[PDB]
Each structure stands twice: as structure tokens, then as C-alpha cells.
Amino acid sequence: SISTAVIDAINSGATLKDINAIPDDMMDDIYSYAYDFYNKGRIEEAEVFFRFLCIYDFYNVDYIMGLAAIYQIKEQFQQAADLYAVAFALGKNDYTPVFHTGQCQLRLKAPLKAKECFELVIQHSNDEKLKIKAQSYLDAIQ
Amino acid sequence: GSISTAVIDAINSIPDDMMDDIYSYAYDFYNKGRIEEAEVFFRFLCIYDFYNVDYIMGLAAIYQIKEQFQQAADLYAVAFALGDYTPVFHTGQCQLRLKAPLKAKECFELVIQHSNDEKLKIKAQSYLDAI
Ligand SMILES: [Cl-]
Ligand SMILES: [Cl-]
Ligand SMILES: [Cl-]
Ligand SMILES: [Cl-]
Ligand SMILES: [Mg+2]
Ligand SMILES: [Mg+2]
Ligand SMILES: [Mg+2]
């Protein structure tokens, strides 16, 4: 993309994805590298790459979920919870981000918020495997 | 929008009574048919305090009125995730208008199965009867 196109996207609130600024295959490569860093415990680098990905397309559920995960690892629990809520909203009937928000709320010493998150999963998810995990946390809340 | 602002704010990183006042001013505009003014005030609220279900619901309503159904549905889902079933009911309406009737049906069924609002349940059933 030409500089005028990128500046227009910044000014108009458009994604860089919307103007095809980086080819699709290269973005897939970047996501794959981001995941490799993550799996290898290279958290700082993974964080750079997931921030890059979310700047490129701030509506991509998996890009957002990767950054949220990184923030949870780095104990930035409120920012992780904030991104998980967005990821839930942009996704397709997946309550896993809400489950992870429950974990974050426990770490923020907000157990009633946590309970509400795990209950949202238990009451509405069709994923019984995810429900088992959410129920495990709920059963441990005092 | 509100969502992209929330995501950008996370990448990079007024008292309650007065915020309540500004919400009421937004609703005052809305009730008088000043939808554009109402929208600005709700957008302001959702930039200042995005993770507030009442501000989200008000802005989503405006997008639905303006036939920006996907943006409305996205905001209704944030309101649902943050903690009644009115967001799910309105998401169902949005999905119908988006020509996604199986998505709509799932929303209305969720309302009927979980809501304690008997009037919302009747409304959801009337949509289900038509899908
Ligand atoms: Cl954790
Ligand atoms: Cl709490
Ligand atoms: Cl938005
Ligand atoms: Cl559908
Ligand atoms: Mg491709
Ligand atoms: Mg057991
Ligand atoms: Mg009522």
C-alpha cells in the first residue's frame, strides 16, 4: 500500500488488512512465527508479534486471543480480560475466552466476577469438555 | 469503533454520578429522535468506559436502528460477556436481518431456555415461529 493509503486507513479507523497492506500468506507466516515463539517460551517476542498482528487486523479473533493469552502469562490480568471479552464477541459461539476471563478474575481477587464467568460457560456452552474445566474452578471457589 | 478503540488501548497498555448524567443526556437525545447526537454521546461513553454494559447496550441499540446489524451484534455480545438476555434477543434480531437464520434461531432458543423474563420469551418464540 502507498503511504497515502495507509495514512487514510489510520485516519478512517480502517484495518491495514482492509487495504491489503501485507499479503495474506505473509500474515499467515507471521502468525505461525508468533505461535512458534509462544510455544518456545519466547514470550517477549511472541508479544511483539501478536501486538503487530492485532494492529494489522484488530478484529481477528485468533490474533486477539493470542495477545490476551500473552497478557495473562505476563500477569496483565485486566488487559487480558478486556481482550478476551472482545474475542468472545467477535467469535462464533465459543466460551473459551470467558473461561480464561474467569481465571483472570480469580487472580485479580474478584471471585464473584470469576464465578459469573464460569457460570456463563457452564450455563450456555455446548462444549462439555470446556464445561468440565469451568466446573472444576467453580467447585474450588469458596 | 468502540471495539477497535478497546483493542488498540489494550495493545498500547469523571465520577459515576456524572457518567450516569451523560448517559441520561444521551437517552434524552435518543428519545427526541436526535439519533446522531445520541450516538456521539454513547460513543464518548464507550471510549471512556467501554466495559460498562449499559453504555454498550445503548450504543448497540443505535447501530441496530441504523441497520448496522453486525456492529450491533458484536456490541450486544460484549454486553452479554460482561454480565439479562436482552442482548441475546437483540442479537437474534440482528442475525435475522443479516440473513443468518440458524444463528438467529440459536439466540432465540437461548432466550427461551434461560430468561426469567416471560415477555422476552414470548417475543423470542414469535421469531422462532417465523424462522
Ligand atoms: Cl493465570
Ligand atoms: Cl468479585
Ligand atoms: Cl464497535
Ligand atoms: Cl445461519
Ligand atoms: Mg489465504
Ligand atoms: Mg468430580
Ligand atoms: Mg419486564
GROMACS .gro file of N, CA, C and O in nm, chain B residues 23-112:
model
  360
  165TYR      N    1  -2.501   0.957   3.039
  165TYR     CA    2  -2.587   0.852   2.984
  165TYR      C    3  -2.731   0.901   2.970
  165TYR      O    4  -2.797   0.877   2.867
  166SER      N    5  -2.782   0.970   3.072
  166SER     CA    6  -2.920   1.016   3.063
  166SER      C    7  -2.937   1.120   2.953
  166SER      O    8  -3.041   1.124   2.886
  167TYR      N    9  -2.836   1.206   2.935
  167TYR     CA   10  -2.840   1.303   2.826
  167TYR      C   11  -2.844   1.234   2.690
  167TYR      O   12  -2.919   1.275   2.599
  168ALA      N   13  -2.764   1.129   2.673
  168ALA     CA   14  -2.767   1.051   2.550
  168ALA      C   15  -2.907   0.997   2.525
  168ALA      O   16  -2.959   1.005   2.414
  169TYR      N   17  -2.968   0.940   2.629
  169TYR     CA   18  -3.103   0.886   2.617
  169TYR      C   19  -3.204   0.997   2.588
  169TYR      O   20  -3.300   0.976   2.513
  170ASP      N   21  -3.182   1.116   2.645
  170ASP     CA   22  -3.271   1.228   2.618
  170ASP      C   23  -3.268   1.261   2.469
  170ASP      O   24  -3.372   1.284   2.407
  171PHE      N   25  -3.148   1.269   2.412
  171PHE     CA   26  -3.137   1.291   2.268
  171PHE      C   27  -3.209   1.180   2.192
  171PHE      O   28  -3.288   1.205   2.101
  172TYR      N   29  -3.181   1.055   2.230
  172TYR     CA   30  -3.241   0.940   2.162
  172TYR      C   31  -3.392   0.950   2.162
  172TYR      O   32  -3.457   0.937   2.057
  173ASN      N   33  -3.451   0.978   2.278
  173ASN     CA   34  -3.596   0.981   2.290
  173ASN      C   35  -3.659   1.091   2.207
  173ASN      O   36  -3.777   1.080   2.170
  174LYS      N   37  -3.584   1.198   2.179
  174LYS     CA   38  -3.632   1.310   2.098
  174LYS      C   39  -3.606   1.289   1.949
  174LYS      O   40  -3.637   1.378   1.869
  175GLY      N   41  -3.555   1.173   1.911
  175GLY     CA   42  -3.522   1.144   1.774
  175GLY      C   43  -3.392   1.201   1.725
  175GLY      O   44  -3.364   1.192   1.605
  176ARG      N   45  -3.310   1.256   1.814
  176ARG     CA   46  -3.179   1.309   1.779
  176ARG      C   47  -3.077   1.194   1.787
  176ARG      O   48  -2.994   1.187   1.876
  177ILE      N   49  -3.088   1.103   1.689
  177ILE     CA   50  -3.012   0.978   1.694
  177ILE      C   51  -2.863   1.002   1.677
  177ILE      O   52  -2.780   0.933   1.737
  178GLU      N   53  -2.827   1.097   1.590
  178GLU     CA   54  -2.686   1.125   1.567
  178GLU      C   55  -2.618   1.181   1.691
  178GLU      O   56  -2.506   1.141   1.724
  179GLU      N   57  -2.684   1.276   1.759
  179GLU     CA   58  -2.633   1.327   1.886
  179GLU      C   59  -2.624   1.216   1.990
  179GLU      O   60  -2.522   1.200   2.058
  180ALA      N   61  -2.730   1.137   2.002
  180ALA     CA   62  -2.727   1.026   2.097
  180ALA      C   63  -2.607   0.937   2.069
  180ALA      O   64  -2.537   0.894   2.162
  181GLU      N   65  -2.581   0.910   1.940
  181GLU     CA   66  -2.473   0.819   1.902
  181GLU      C   67  -2.338   0.874   1.945
  181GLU      O   68  -2.252   0.799   1.996
  182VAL      N   69  -2.316   1.004   1.925
  182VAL     CA   70  -2.191   1.066   1.970
  182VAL      C   71  -2.175   1.048   2.120
  182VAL      O   72  -2.065   1.016   2.169
  183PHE      N   73  -2.281   1.075   2.197
  183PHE     CA   74  -2.271   1.065   2.342
  183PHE      C   75  -2.244   0.921   2.385
  183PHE      O   76  -2.162   0.898   2.476
  184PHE      N   77  -2.310   0.822   2.322
  184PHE     CA   78  -2.282   0.683   2.358
  184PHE      C   79  -2.142   0.642   2.313
  184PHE      O   80  -2.073   0.567   2.384
  185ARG      N   81  -2.095   0.692   2.197
  185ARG     CA   82  -1.958   0.660   2.156
  185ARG      C   83  -1.858   0.716   2.256
  185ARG      O   84  -1.754   0.653   2.283
  186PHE      N   85  -1.882   0.840   2.303
  186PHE     CA   86  -1.799   0.900   2.407
  186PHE      C   87  -1.794   0.813   2.531
  186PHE      O   88  -1.688   0.785   2.588
  187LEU      N   89  -1.911   0.767   2.574
  187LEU     CA   90  -1.917   0.683   2.694
  187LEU      C   91  -1.840   0.553   2.676
  187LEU      O   92  -1.772   0.507   2.769
  188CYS      N   93  -1.855   0.490   2.560
  188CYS     CA   94  -1.788   0.363   2.532
  188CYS      C   95  -1.639   0.380   2.503
  188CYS      O   96  -1.569   0.279   2.497
  189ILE      N   97  -1.590   0.501   2.473
  189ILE     CA   98  -1.446   0.522   2.474
  189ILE      C   99  -1.396   0.539   2.616
  189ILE      O  100  -1.294   0.482   2.655
  190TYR      N  101  -1.469   0.618   2.696
  190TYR     CA  102  -1.427   0.648   2.832
  190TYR      C  103  -1.437   0.526   2.923
  190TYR      O  104  -1.352   0.504   3.010
  191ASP      N  105  -1.544   0.448   2.909
  191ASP     CA  106  -1.565   0.333   2.997
  191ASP      C  107  -1.633   0.225   2.913
  191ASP      O  108  -1.754   0.201   2.922
  192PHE      N  109  -1.552   0.153   2.836
  192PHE     CA  110  -1.607   0.061   2.737
  192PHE      C  111  -1.669  -0.061   2.801
  192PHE      O  112  -1.769  -0.113   2.751
  193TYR      N  113  -1.619  -0.101   2.916
  193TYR     CA  114  -1.661  -0.227   2.976
  193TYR      C  115  -1.775  -0.204   3.074
  193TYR      O  116  -1.773  -0.244   3.190
  194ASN      N  117  -1.872  -0.127   3.027
  194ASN     CA  118  -1.992  -0.090   3.101
  194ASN      C  119  -2.115  -0.134   3.022
  194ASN      O  120  -2.141  -0.081   2.914
  195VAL      N  121  -2.192  -0.229   3.076
  195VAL     CA  122  -2.294  -0.293   2.992
  195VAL      C  123  -2.402  -0.195   2.949
  195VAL      O  124  -2.456  -0.206   2.838
  196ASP      N  125  -2.434  -0.096   3.032
  196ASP     CA  126  -2.541  -0.003   2.994
  196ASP      C  127  -2.498   0.088   2.880
  196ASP      O  128  -2.579   0.118   2.792
  197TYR      N  129  -2.373   0.134   2.880
  197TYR     CA  130  -2.324   0.216   2.770
  197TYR      C  131  -2.318   0.135   2.642
  197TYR      O  132  -2.357   0.184   2.535
  198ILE      N  133  -2.270   0.011   2.651
  198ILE     CA  134  -2.263  -0.078   2.535
  198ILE      C  135  -2.403  -0.102   2.478
  198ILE      O  136  -2.424  -0.093   2.356
  199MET      N  137  -2.500  -0.131   2.564
  199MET     CA  138  -2.634  -0.163   2.515
  199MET      C  139  -2.696  -0.045   2.444
  199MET      O  140  -2.769  -0.063   2.346
  200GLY      N  141  -2.674   0.077   2.495
  200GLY     CA  142  -2.731   0.194   2.432
  200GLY      C  143  -2.674   0.218   2.294
  200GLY      O  144  -2.747   0.249   2.199
  201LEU      N  145  -2.542   0.204   2.280
  201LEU     CA  146  -2.479   0.222   2.151
  201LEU      C  147  -2.519   0.112   2.054
  201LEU      O  148  -2.543   0.138   1.935
  202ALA      N  149  -2.525  -0.013   2.101
  202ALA     CA  150  -2.568  -0.122   2.014
  202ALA      C  151  -2.709  -0.096   1.961
  202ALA      O  152  -2.739  -0.127   1.845
  203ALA      N  153  -2.798  -0.045   2.046
  203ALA     CA  154  -2.934  -0.014   2.002
  203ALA      C  155  -2.932   0.085   1.887
  203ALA      O  156  -3.008   0.071   1.791
  204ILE      N  157  -2.845   0.186   1.897
  204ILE     CA  158  -2.837   0.286   1.791
  204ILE      C  159  -2.789   0.222   1.662
  204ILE      O  160  -2.843   0.249   1.554
  205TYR      N  161  -2.685   0.138   1.669
  205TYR     CA  162  -2.640   0.071   1.548
  205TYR      C  163  -2.750  -0.017   1.488
  205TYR      O  164  -2.763  -0.024   1.365
  206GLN      N  165  -2.828  -0.085   1.572
  206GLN     CA  166  -2.935  -0.168   1.518
  206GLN      C  167  -3.041  -0.083   1.448
  206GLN      O  168  -3.088  -0.118   1.338
  207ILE      N  169  -3.078   0.029   1.509
  207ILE     CA  170  -3.171   0.121   1.446
  207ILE      C  171  -3.119   0.165   1.311
  207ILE      O  172  -3.196   0.180   1.214
  208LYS      N  173  -2.989   0.194   1.303
  208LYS     CA  174  -2.925   0.244   1.183
  208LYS      C  175  -2.892   0.132   1.085
  208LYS      O  176  -2.831   0.157   0.981
  209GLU      N  177  -2.934   0.009   1.115
  209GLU     CA  178  -2.919  -0.106   1.027
  209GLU      C  179  -2.773  -0.143   1.008
  209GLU      O  180  -2.734  -0.201   0.906
  210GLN      N  181  -2.692  -0.112   1.108
  210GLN     CA  182  -2.556  -0.162   1.117
  210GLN      C  183  -2.557  -0.286   1.206
  210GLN      O  184  -2.511  -0.285   1.321
  211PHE      N  185  -2.613  -0.392   1.149
  211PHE     CA  186  -2.654  -0.506   1.231
  211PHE      C  187  -2.535  -0.585   1.283
  211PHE      O  188  -2.540  -0.638   1.395
  212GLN      N  189  -2.428  -0.597   1.205
  212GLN     CA  190  -2.312  -0.672   1.254
  212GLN      C  191  -2.245  -0.597   1.368
  212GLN      O  192  -2.202  -0.657   1.468
  213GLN      N  193  -2.233  -0.467   1.355
  213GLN     CA  194  -2.169  -0.390   1.461
  213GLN      C  195  -2.255  -0.395   1.586
  213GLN      O  196  -2.204  -0.408   1.698
  214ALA      N  197  -2.386  -0.390   1.568
  214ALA     CA  198  -2.476  -0.402   1.683
  214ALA      C  199  -2.458  -0.538   1.751
  214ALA      O  200  -2.444  -0.547   1.874
  215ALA      N  201  -2.458  -0.646   1.671
  215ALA     CA  202  -2.446  -0.780   1.729
  215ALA      C  203  -2.316  -0.796   1.806
  215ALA      O  204  -2.312  -0.861   1.912
  216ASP      N  205  -2.206  -0.744   1.751
  216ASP     CA  206  -2.078  -0.751   1.819
  216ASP      C  207  -2.085  -0.684   1.955
  216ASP      O  208  -2.035  -0.738   2.054
  217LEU      N  209  -2.147  -0.565   1.962
  217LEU     CA  210  -2.157  -0.496   2.090
  217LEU      C  211  -2.250  -0.569   2.186
  217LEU      O  212  -2.220  -0.580   2.306
  218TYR      N  213  -2.363  -0.622   2.137
  218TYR     CA  214  -2.451  -0.697   2.226
  218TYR      C  215  -2.375  -0.813   2.290
  218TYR      O  216  -2.395  -0.843   2.408
  219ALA      N  217  -2.287  -0.878   2.214
  219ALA     CA  218  -2.212  -0.990   2.269
  219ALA      C  219  -2.117  -0.945   2.380
  219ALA      O  220  -2.096  -1.018   2.478
  220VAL      N  221  -2.053  -0.829   2.363
  220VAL     CA  222  -1.968  -0.778   2.471
  220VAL      C  223  -2.052  -0.758   2.596
  220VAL      O  224  -2.011  -0.799   2.706
  221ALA      N  225  -2.172  -0.700   2.581
  221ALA     CA  226  -2.259  -0.678   2.695
  221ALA      C  227  -2.296  -0.810   2.762
  221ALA      O  228  -2.300  -0.819   2.885
  222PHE      N  229  -2.323  -0.914   2.682
  222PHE     CA  230  -2.352  -1.046   2.738
  222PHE      C  231  -2.231  -1.100   2.815
  222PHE      O  232  -2.246  -1.152   2.926
  223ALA      N  233  -2.111  -1.090   2.758
  223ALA     CA  234  -1.992  -1.146   2.823
  223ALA      C  235  -1.961  -1.074   2.955
  223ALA      O  236  -1.908  -1.137   3.048
  224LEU      N  237  -1.992  -0.945   2.963
  224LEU     CA  238  -1.960  -0.865   3.081
  224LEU      C  239  -2.062  -0.880   3.194
  224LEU      O  240  -2.042  -0.821   3.300
  225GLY      N  241  -2.171  -0.953   3.171
  225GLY     CA  242  -2.271  -0.977   3.274
  225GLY      C  243  -2.393  -0.887   3.270
  225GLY      O  244  -2.445  -0.856   3.163
  226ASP      N  245  -2.932  -0.995   3.200
  226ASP     CA  246  -3.049  -1.050   3.135
  226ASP      C  247  -3.014  -1.086   2.990
  226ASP      O  248  -2.902  -1.068   2.943
  227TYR      N  249  -3.113  -1.142   2.922
  227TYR     CA  250  -3.095  -1.195   2.789
  227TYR      C  251  -3.135  -1.097   2.680
  227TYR      O  252  -3.135  -1.135   2.563
  228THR      N  253  -3.163  -0.970   2.714
  228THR     CA  254  -3.195  -0.875   2.608
  228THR      C  255  -3.084  -0.863   2.504
  228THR      O  256  -3.116  -0.853   2.385
  229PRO      N  257  -2.955  -0.865   2.539
  229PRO     CA  258  -2.853  -0.863   2.432
  229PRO      C  259  -2.861  -0.982   2.339
  229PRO      O  260  -2.838  -0.968   2.218
  230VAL      N  261  -2.895  -1.100   2.391
  230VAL     CA  262  -2.905  -1.219   2.307
  230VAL      C  263  -3.028  -1.210   2.217
  230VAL      O  264  -3.025  -1.248   2.099
  231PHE      N  265  -3.139  -1.162   2.273
  231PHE     CA  266  -3.260  -1.140   2.195
  231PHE      C  267  -3.234  -1.043   2.080
  231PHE      O  268  -3.271  -1.070   1.965
  232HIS      N  269  -3.171  -0.929   2.108
  232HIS     CA  270  -3.146  -0.833   2.001
  232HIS      C  271  -3.042  -0.887   1.902
  232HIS      O  272  -3.051  -0.857   1.782
  233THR      N  273  -2.946  -0.967   1.949
  233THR     CA  274  -2.853  -1.030   1.855
  233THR      C  275  -2.930  -1.119   1.759
  233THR      O  276  -2.899  -1.123   1.638
  234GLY      N  277  -3.031  -1.191   1.810
  234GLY     CA  278  -3.113  -1.274   1.723
  234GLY      C  279  -3.179  -1.192   1.614
  234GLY      O  280  -3.181  -1.232   1.498
  235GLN      N  281  -3.234  -1.076   1.651
  235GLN     CA  282  -3.294  -0.988   1.553
  235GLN      C  283  -3.191  -0.945   1.450
  235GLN      O  284  -3.219  -0.943   1.329
  236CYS      N  285  -3.072  -0.908   1.497
  236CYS     CA  286  -2.967  -0.866   1.404
  236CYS      C  287  -2.929  -0.977   1.309
  236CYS      O  288  -2.908  -0.953   1.190
  237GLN      N  289  -2.917  -1.100   1.361
  237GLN     CA  290  -2.878  -1.212   1.275
  237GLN      C  291  -2.985  -1.241   1.171
  237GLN      O  292  -2.953  -1.269   1.055
  238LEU      N  293  -3.113  -1.231   1.209
  238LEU     CA  294  -3.218  -1.243   1.108
  238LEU      C  295  -3.199  -1.141   0.996
  238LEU      O  296  -3.209  -1.175   0.878
  239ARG      N  297  -3.173  -1.015   1.032
  239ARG     CA  298  -3.156  -0.913   0.929
  239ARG      C  299  -3.029  -0.937   0.849
  239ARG      O  300  -3.020  -0.894   0.734
  240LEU      N  301  -2.929  -1.002   0.909
  240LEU     CA  302  -2.808  -1.039   0.838
  240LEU      C  303  -2.826  -1.165   0.754
  240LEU      O  304  -2.730  -1.212   0.693
  241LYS      N  305  -2.948  -1.218   0.748
  241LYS     CA  306  -2.980  -1.338   0.671
  241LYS      C  307  -2.903  -1.460   0.723
  241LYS      O  308  -2.862  -1.549   0.646
  242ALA      N  309  -2.890  -1.470   0.856
  242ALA     CA  310  -2.827  -1.584   0.923
  242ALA      C  311  -2.930  -1.646   1.017
  242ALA      O  312  -2.922  -1.630   1.139
  243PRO      N  313  -3.029  -1.716   0.961
  243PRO     CA  314  -3.143  -1.759   1.044
  243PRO      C  315  -3.108  -1.870   1.142
  243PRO      O  316  -3.173  -1.879   1.247
  244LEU      N  317  -3.011  -1.955   1.111
  244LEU     CA  318  -2.974  -2.057   1.209
  244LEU      C  319  -2.906  -1.993   1.329
  244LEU      O  320  -2.929  -2.035   1.442
  245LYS      N  321  -2.823  -1.891   1.305
  245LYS     CA  322  -2.768  -1.812   1.415
  245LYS      C  323  -2.879  -1.745   1.496
  245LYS      O  324  -2.880  -1.748   1.619
  246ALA      N  325  -2.974  -1.682   1.426
  246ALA     CA  326  -3.085  -1.619   1.496
  246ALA      C  327  -3.159  -1.719   1.582
  246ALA      O  328  -3.189  -1.694   1.700
  247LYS      N  329  -3.190  -1.836   1.525
  247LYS     CA  330  -3.265  -1.936   1.598
  247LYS      C  331  -3.196  -1.974   1.729
  247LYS      O  332  -3.261  -1.983   1.834
  248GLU      N  333  -3.064  -1.994   1.724
  248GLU     CA  334  -2.989  -2.031   1.844
  248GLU      C  335  -3.001  -1.924   1.951
  248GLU      O  336  -3.012  -1.956   2.070
  249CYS      N  337  -2.995  -1.797   1.910
  249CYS     CA  338  -3.013  -1.687   2.004
  249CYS      C  339  -3.151  -1.692   2.070
  249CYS      O  340  -3.163  -1.680   2.192
  250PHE      N  341  -3.256  -1.705   1.989
  250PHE     CA  342  -3.390  -1.704   2.045
  250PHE      C  343  -3.414  -1.826   2.133
  250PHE      O  344  -3.480  -1.815   2.236
  251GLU      N  345  -3.357  -1.941   2.096
  251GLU     CA  346  -3.372  -2.059   2.182
  251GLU      C  347  -3.304  -2.038   2.315
  251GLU      O  348  -3.357  -2.076   2.420
  252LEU      N  349  -3.185  -1.977   2.312
  252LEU     CA  350  -3.115  -1.945   2.436
  252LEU      C  351  -3.200  -1.857   2.526
  252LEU      O  352  -3.208  -1.880   2.646
  253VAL      N  353  -3.266  -1.755   2.468
  253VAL     CA  354  -3.356  -1.671   2.547
  253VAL      C  355  -3.465  -1.756   2.612
  253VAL      O  356  -3.492  -1.745   2.733
  254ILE      N  357  -3.533  -1.839   2.532
  254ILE     CA  358  -3.646  -1.915   2.585
  254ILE      C  359  -3.600  -2.010   2.695
  254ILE      O  360  -3.671  -2.032   2.794
   0.00000   0.00000   0.00000
